[PDB]
Design an enzyme around this catalytic site. Structure first.
Site, PDB file in Angstrom:
ATOM      1  N   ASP B  84       0.828  -1.191   0.000  1.00 38.77           N
ATOM      2  CA  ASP B  84       0.000   0.000   0.000  1.00 38.77           C
ATOM      3  C   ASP B  84       0.873   1.256   0.000  1.00 38.77           C
ATOM      4  O   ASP B  84       1.837   1.343   0.762  1.00 38.77           O
ATOM      5  CB  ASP B  84      -0.924  -0.023   1.215  1.00 38.77           C
ATOM      6  CG  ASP B  84      -2.044   0.996   1.128  1.00 38.77           C
ATOM      7  OD1 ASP B  84      -2.296   1.528   0.029  1.00 38.77           O
ATOM      8  OD2 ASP B  84      -2.679   1.252   2.174  1.00 38.77           O
ATOM      9  N   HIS B  85       0.533   2.212  -0.866  1.00 35.66           N
ATOM     10  CA  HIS B  85       1.282   3.468  -0.997  1.00 35.66           C
ATOM     11  C   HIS B  85       2.799   3.246  -1.107  1.00 35.66           C
ATOM     12  O   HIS B  85       3.578   3.866  -0.381  1.00 35.66           O
ATOM     13  CB  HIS B  85       0.971   4.398   0.179  1.00 35.66           C
ATOM     14  CG  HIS B  85      -0.426   4.940   0.161  1.00 35.66           C
ATOM     15  ND1 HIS B  85      -0.821   5.942  -0.699  1.00 35.66           N
ATOM     16  CD2 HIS B  85      -1.520   4.612   0.889  1.00 35.66           C
ATOM     17  CE1 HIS B  85      -2.103   6.205  -0.504  1.00 35.66           C
ATOM     18  NE2 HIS B  85      -2.549   5.419   0.459  1.00 35.66           N
ATOM     19  N   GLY B 179      -8.712  12.189   7.805  1.00 34.39           N
ATOM     20  CA  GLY B 179      -8.334  12.806   9.067  1.00 34.39           C
ATOM     21  C   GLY B 179      -9.524  13.072   9.971  1.00 34.39           C
ATOM     22  O   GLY B 179     -10.666  12.781   9.614  1.00 34.39           O
ATOM     23  N   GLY B 203     -11.699   6.088   2.408  1.00 31.67           N
ATOM     24  CA  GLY B 203     -13.038   5.550   2.562  1.00 31.67           C
ATOM     25  C   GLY B 203     -13.607   5.687   3.964  1.00 31.67           C
ATOM     26  O   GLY B 203     -14.823   5.720   4.134  1.00 31.67           O
ATOM     27  N   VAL B 224      -9.354  -0.111   3.759  1.00 33.67           N
ATOM     28  CA  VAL B 224      -9.878  -0.086   5.110  1.00 33.67           C
ATOM     29  C   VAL B 224      -8.744  -0.281   6.086  1.00 33.67           C
ATOM     30  O   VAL B 224      -8.007  -1.267   5.997  1.00 33.67           O
ATOM     31  CB  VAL B 224     -10.934  -1.203   5.335  1.00 33.67           C
ATOM     32  CG1 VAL B 224     -11.374  -1.243   6.802  1.00 33.67           C
ATOM     33  CG2 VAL B 224     -12.121  -1.008   4.399  1.00 33.67           C
TER      34      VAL B 224
HETATM   35 ZN   LIG Z   1      -4.592   5.360   0.935  1.00 38.00          ZN
END
Ligand SMILES: [Zn+2]
Ligand SMILES: [Zn+2]
Lengths: 278, 279
Positions: B84-85, B179, B203, B224
């Site tokens: 992820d990222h 945030g 999300g 998630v």
């Molecule tokens: Zn993300």
């Protein structure tokens, strides 16, 4: 490397130190114990109870996880993966087939002859796979029981179990509780059996009794609750001082650190530092 | 079995549901997410941020752990292990060489031509290893910034990046914050023109009905993470605040795991992922 307990406990016995068995309960426990021992140039035994293994989904998961960490943490010390208080031949076989390098078959509450038979059966299987085997005689004490529920290992039983089964290490209960250790008895059993001895119920035993036991043949000492207490205290402290934190890393990270520092303390106590060689 | 996201997200997009990416942070997170998805007969994506991987000692440790669990938990559903990222080609390569089946190369904060170049490089490496690739355009908002720091993905950029790189999935930021109001018509055009499954970041806190609207417009993957951390942390606090004596890690992290498991099942129900895993 992943090794059994056999050569590391012989070296420990011969040179007057002990190797701690530190029980693992999840990833963070395993990381802390491995990093601590590597940083201390010390061999280590990773202990797994049957309940801990169920919690970690299985024996195979544990071995996979340790293999991962050996690589990513650049572990070069000797590491044993040890089934703690194994309740049956079947459970011992299951752990070994999944990749465990050591097992304790605990039949100390069975009639002595059954302890011998079951232990003998486990050794026959384990020694075919290079797996070391620990067995137990006597009972660790601790409510309101006479003699505090302490039953010393019988020196004749100890001798006979060793001769008939071929176990690699022996856990003779000799006054520990879960306290006054029978140092004379310990010496007799160590000398007569010629095996490294294992100390259960070590939590709370003074450093001075711990260090008396070691030259009498105690070469393996089990450690569990001390790590649980230290990690739980660090989690509580984080969560009690910041009511907003929810990132698991921000309370389990400190828990891991607390284990790591607990384990290094035990390593110093046990004399295990700088015993890992090439 | 362990698979990339490729066929997984194509089937989702075709049939109007999404596959959740549930981020893992340790053993108990991974257990909960796998058990919940298996019990729901649903494919699943295990998300791993670079910081989570550092926490878990490394990519290799994570793959070994998942392999262990696939066996011990009798997992039969499709499982992807997804970086992820991912912040560079080098990080994507490291994760792939360790056994990851999917990566996101996130160059969305770089000039568009650099995003295209870095992403193209990742895809060429990944696709020769059978690894699926996600990239990102636009910015997720959320402080005191104009327009709340929201920058919609540009449809022309979306189209061009897909054509030039060959990515398998696209994350177009379209009003998500971290945030909010999703740009549903923009989402529709990008889905249609690129023909790729779309990924939704940010999300958390998006109401179920906007989630429900996003999916037929092409959103096939929804990330998630914080929802699980919040639920697990609350379970730990409740155990420890109710019993001041407890120290066995299983007595508070066990409930944490159960809390993650029930959170994940909830998301699975929202996303429509139940009973989508085929034999
Ligand atoms: Zn993300
Ligand atoms: Zn014990």
């Amino acid at each position: 490397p992943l090794v059994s307990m056999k050569e590391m406990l012989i070296d420990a016995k011969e040179n007057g130190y002990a190797v701690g068995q530190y029980n693992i309960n999840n990833l963070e426990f395993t990381q802390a114990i491995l990093e601590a021992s590597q940083e201390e140039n010390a061999p280590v035994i990773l202990g797994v109870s049957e309940g801990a293994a169920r919690y970690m989904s299985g024996f195979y998961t544990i071995v996979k996880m340790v293999e991962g960490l050996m690589h990513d943490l650049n572990i070069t010390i000797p590491v044993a993966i040890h089934l703690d208080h194994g309740s049956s031949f079947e459970k011992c076989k299951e752990a070994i087939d999944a990749g465990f390098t050591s097992v304790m078959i605990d039949a100390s509450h069975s009639p002595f002859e059954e302890n011998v038979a079951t232990t003998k059966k486990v050794v026959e299987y384990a020694h075919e796979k290079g797996v070391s085997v620990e067995a137990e005689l006597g009972t660790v004490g601790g409510d309101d029981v006479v003699a505090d529920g302490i039953i010393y290992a019988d020196p004749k039983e100890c001798q006979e179990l060793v001769e008939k089964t071929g176990i690699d290490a022996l856990a003779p209960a000799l006054g520990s509780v879960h306290p006054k250790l029978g140092f004379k008895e310990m010496e007799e059993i160590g000398l007569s059996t010629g095996l490294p001895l294992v100390l259960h119920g070590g939590t709370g035993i003074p450093t001075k009794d711990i260090q008396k036991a070691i030259p009498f043949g105690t070469a393996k000492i089990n450690v569990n609750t001390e790590n649980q207490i230290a990690s739980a205290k660090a989690v509580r402290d984080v969560l009690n001082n910041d009511k907003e934190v929810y990132d698991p890393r921000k309370y389990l990270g400190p828990a891991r650190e607390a284990i790591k520092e607990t384990v290094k303390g035990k390593i110093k106590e046990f004399g295990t530092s700088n015993r890992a060689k090439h």
